Design a protein around this nucleic acid. Structure first.
Ligand SMILES: [Mn+2]
Ligand SMILES: [Mn+2]
Ligand SMILES: [Mn+2]
Ligand SMILES: [Mn+2]
Ligand SMILES: [Mn+2]
Ligand SMILES: [Mn+2]
Ligand SMILES: [Mn+2]
Ligand SMILES: [Mn+2]
Ligand SMILES: [Mn+2]
Ligand SMILES: [Mn+2]
Ligand SMILES: [Mn+2]
Ligand SMILES: [Mn+2]
Ligand SMILES: [Mn+2]
Ligand SMILES: [Mn+2]
Ligand SMILES: [Mn+2]
Ligand SMILES: [Mn+2]
Ligand SMILES: [Mn+2]
Ligand SMILES: [Mn+2]
Ligand SMILES: [Mn+2]
Ligand SMILES: [Mn+2]
Ligand SMILES: [Mn+2]
Ligand SMILES: [Mn+2]
Ligand SMILES: [Mn+2]
Ligand SMILES: [Mn+2]
Ligand SMILES: [Mn+2]
Ligand SMILES: [Mn+2]
Ligand SMILES: [Mn+2]
Ligand SMILES: [Mn+2]
Ligand SMILES: [Mn+2]
Ligand SMILES: [Mn+2]
Ligand SMILES: [Mn+2]
Ligand SMILES: [Mn+2]
Ligand SMILES: [Mn+2]
Ligand SMILES: [Mn+2]
Ligand SMILES: [Mn+2]
Ligand SMILES: [Mn+2]
Ligand SMILES: [Mn+2]
Ligand SMILES: [Mn+2]
Ligand SMILES: [Mn+2]
Ligand SMILES: [Mn+2]
Ligand SMILES: [Mn+2]
Ligand SMILES: [Mn+2]
Ligand SMILES: [Mn+2]
Ligand SMILES: [Mn+2]
Ligand SMILES: [Mn+2]
Lengths: 99, 79, 106, 99, 99, 87, 104, 99
DNA sequence: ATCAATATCCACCTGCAGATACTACCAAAAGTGTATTTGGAAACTGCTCCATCAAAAGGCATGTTCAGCTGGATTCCAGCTGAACATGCCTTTTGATGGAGCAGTTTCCAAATACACTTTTGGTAGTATCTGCAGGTGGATATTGAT
DNA sequence: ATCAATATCCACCTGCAGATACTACCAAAAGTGTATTTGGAAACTGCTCCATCAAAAGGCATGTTCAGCTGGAATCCAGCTGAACATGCCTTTTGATGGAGCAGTTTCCAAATACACTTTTGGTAGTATCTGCAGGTGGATATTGAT
């Protein structure tokens, strides 16, 4: 049963997981889930597109986490940027100190 | 009809959602002409994406991409 | 497959998927290891913020299921999310209750 | 005397009602007719996913609804409370839609 | 006896003159100090290529000039010929710069 | 031999006559007295935003000098594309 | 024989082709893409220099300067939209005073 | 020859050629040429960028003259588009007919 | 002030759309090991150009005075737009059936990439000389505003 | 209509900044020519979902009446703001300077891509059960607008 299955992937299940951590007793409708899927795709494209630009400006071929960071600063409103940087630095730390 | 199918009560309900209390009688023609210009602009772009992909069906994606490049991004139909 | 990179990074967002999406993205010739980790964390963070606020919006309205309307109230009542999403339309979100004071009786 | 409401009382009542709901405010079929006719100018013999037509309606309504907010500001700026075509014209010019 | 032009006549004379020329209208050095003052509040020990300062000035003057056009449209809408802060405010609210 | 005097209140260097001239290019005939302070506020916000982004580019490139390209990229991303200065 | 002369173009095909790869726009660039893009770039260059040239001739000058570019763009409906969000350094603006501002 | 400053490429000689074609007795100031240079880079990035997006939307790894053409139709208005499309097709046709 | 007419609200109720749960299955995703490659950090330093200084001088800012005319307040009324009510015509729905055509799949070739070697060129650099026009003058004609 | 103060016009001019012209050099660009690989067009077709009916069911639009109240015209006057003037200072311009820091060139390795290989997982599909909340009811009470 593989035929009519061009995998249409989305962030929906990962959105769902994060939901349960912040509001364990709250559900979310399909249309709402669709909004969130669009949200994550949008922010992804904005952030990555911006990091791409940074790399080209500086004559580099690698999108590193430094490019993701600067992009975040340039694109997120003040305080929302501060927290995002914090979450990002945090996860790039734990990842390194791991196996 | 057609454009005239967008009716006075419809426009009025819109305006109300926009917080409008009192509406001049000529607002109805101005609005219709405004809606037509919006749709042409968007549909042109959507149909252009459609032609490109050699389809005969305008798909939600075609509309969503047209909206994105007119700086009117829409969330909810990106399936 | 030993441990997922997401568990390594301590995240619920699919690091491997983000990595892959960067490559096929044609964003750059190459991709550092840390970059999709950072990006995934950022996306996860931003998702948490909106669901948190939209969750609150569901409580205030005596509901336990988030619907578009709730995401619209969450985003528009928040200065920072509202600016980030300033050129975005959330379908079936409606608008915020707002009447210009000069239109009020007497 | 049969009962009557002062002009503008029901107007307010409706602003409060429609700012509470999210349902679309143009009837579905006349809109569809309109869409199909405009598209026919760009390419004959078209078909539309039903979700494609729904996207246009959402976008159109959100567009007109926000234009009315701005138009209202323009009327109020001229010490009126009645929106007029010149209010729509001014808002669109300043948005760069006419200009 | 001593000659006087009526109020508004020199004003129109100056519109014609300034719309005909292209030179910058804020003085160079004071604008440079402003840029350095604002910059240094973000980050110390920064330097500027001079054409960087020219770039900010050309941009800032194009911005303000276009704002005054819009402001002027708002005044006229209110049946005045005098621009007031509420005209600048309404222009910026409609342009999406404010709310 | 090393200087750098304190910089303060340079917004007042956007003088009344400079603002008047700008309004004229803008086709403005008459100007209310409070416009001047309002315009200064509006310029300050515009410059902060362009500079914040401009300096973000500079720092990222690990430079100590803001270049014309820094400012030009800062302008493009806020959708005020500037021609005449490179790129 | 250069690709430019082979396509009938003043604008450099090889360079456009090269910039298309450097820019990371897609995994592959087909042979016709740079040729078409060089054709469009040359056509727009041409259309704006035509109109700027006239603006220059209108002010009794032989050397195009930024004012002339600005005049050409703003006086042409289509270039005006294409460059609607663009600022041309040293261009100034169009002579234009609103009617209510004139005396009588 | 000071430790060779790395070469900076522009469209100047090309803009110049075209200029001599449309106005055989007209010069261009170097500031003007700088604007023209920005103009050509601006339009290149806008077209290639749309093209890039097109390709992705249709799961295509190749930017063809077909992608550039749609980009041109999407990005340019009315008569500019019709003529641009036309000079594009002509050029491509001429190019493939050689050899 | 009273008191009637409607709207709006909250508590409670029940059907059902849409959400949830389990199970089977499976490509393509992801991890992992290991062979090869190279981007761009480090270190050293050449050479552009930024910050700074000096001095001179006049273009332009500042501050004032004076009164013209604009904005802002008030009044007034004709008429346009809201409210309500009565028709009735069309949108909605919902179900049910062709069949267009989107999307999966397999086949295969024209066209893209990789690569090597050879030629051509646009950018820089150094040095030397034209030229379009900004800015100055002077005198003639046009616009403004007091009568 | 006359007349006078002043701006604006344009022909004329001259310095010089910027534009232009030559040679000379060469690292990178561009073209050429084979070898190797593959994207995606082509054809065929299965199955999703789109256009089109029929068919009440009524919710919603339309047309009309009537008057409240808003927009716009007209009237006034206080003082805000433009024009002109005097005074002089700080920007502008010109030229010189040490030197910070950008940017070139080379060496070199931590980390990337490339490829094979095993294991895992998110998406789809089928079938079954569950439940949050729209939409109805009733009755309280708040709002509005007439006395
Ligand atoms: Mn929580
Ligand atoms: Mn009633
Ligand atoms: Mn400071
Ligand atoms: Mn009662
Ligand atoms: Mn109650
Ligand atoms: Mn009760
Ligand atoms: Mn139900
Ligand atoms: Mn169901
Ligand atoms: Mn079960
Ligand atoms: Mn794989
Ligand atoms: Mn290397
Ligand atoms: Mn290297
Ligand atoms: Mn080393
Ligand atoms: Mn002084
Ligand atoms: Mn007088
Ligand atoms: Mn007076
Ligand atoms: Mn006085
Ligand atoms: Mn007045
Ligand atoms: Mn009356
Ligand atoms: Mn009237
Ligand atoms: Mn009247
Ligand atoms: Mn078929
Ligand atoms: Mn296909
Ligand atoms: Mn082809
Ligand atoms: Mn080979
Ligand atoms: Mn050459
Ligand atoms: Mn010579
Ligand atoms: Mn001159
Ligand atoms: Mn003179
Ligand atoms: Mn003469
Ligand atoms: Mn000179
Ligand atoms: Mn293949
Ligand atoms: Mn393929
Ligand atoms: Mn075949
Ligand atoms: Mn009456
Ligand atoms: Mn009124
Ligand atoms: Mn009024
Ligand atoms: Mn007053
Ligand atoms: Mn005088
Ligand atoms: Mn001087
Ligand atoms: Mn140093
Ligand atoms: Mn690193
Ligand atoms: Mn699973
Ligand atoms: Mn309910
Ligand atoms: Mn009841």
């Amino acid at each position: 049963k593989k035929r009519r299955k061009t995998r249409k992937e989305s962030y929906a299940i990962y959105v769902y997981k994060v939901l349960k951590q912040v509001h364990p007793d709250t559900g979310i409708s399909s249309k709402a889930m669709s909004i969130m899927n669009s949200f994550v795709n949008d922010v992804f494209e904005r952030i990555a597109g911006e990091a791409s630009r940074l790399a080209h400006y500086n004559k580099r071929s690698t999108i590193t986490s430094r490019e993701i960071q600067t992009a975040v600063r340039l694109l997120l409103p003040g305080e929302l940027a501060k927290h995002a940087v914090s979450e990002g630095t945090k996860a790039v730390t734990k990842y390194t100190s791991a196996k | 009809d057609n454009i005239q199918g967008i009716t006075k009560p419809a426009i009025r309900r819109l305006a109300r959602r926009g917080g409008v209390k009192r509406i001049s009688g000529l607002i109805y023609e101005e609005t219709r002409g405004v809606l037509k210009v919006f749709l042409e602009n968007v549909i042109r772009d959507a149909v252009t994406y459609t032609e490109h992909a050699k389809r005969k069906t305008v798909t939600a994606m075609d509309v969503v991409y047209a909206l994105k490049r007119q700086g009117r991004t829409l969330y909810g139909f990106g399936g | 497959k030993a441990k997922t990179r997401s568990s390594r990074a301590g995240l619920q967002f699919p690091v491997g998927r983000v990595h892959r999406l960067l490559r096929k993205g044609n964003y750059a010739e190459r991709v550092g290891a840390g970059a999709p980790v950072y990006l995934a964390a950022v996306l996860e963070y931003l998702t948490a913020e909106i669901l948190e606020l939209a969750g609150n919006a569901a409580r205030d309205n005596k509901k336990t299921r988030i619907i578009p309307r709730h995401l619209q109230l969450a985003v528009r009542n928040d200065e920072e999310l509202n600016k980030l999403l300033g050129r975005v339309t959330i379908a079936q979100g409606g608008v915020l209750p707002n009447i210009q004071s000069v239109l009020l009786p007497k | 005397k049969p009962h009557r409401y002062r002009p503008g009382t029901v107007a307010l009542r409706e602003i409060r009602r429609y700012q509470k709901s999210t349902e679309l405010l143009i009837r579905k079929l006349p809109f569809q007719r309109l869409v199909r006719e405009i598209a026919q100018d760009f390419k004959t013999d078209l078909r539309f996913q039903s979700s494609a037509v729904m996207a246009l309606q959402e976008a159109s309504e959100a567009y007109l609804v926000a234009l009315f907010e701005d138009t209202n500001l323009c009327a109020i700026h001229a010490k009126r409370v009645t929106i007029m075509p010149k209010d729509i014209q001014l808002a669109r010019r300043i948005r760069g839609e006419r200009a």
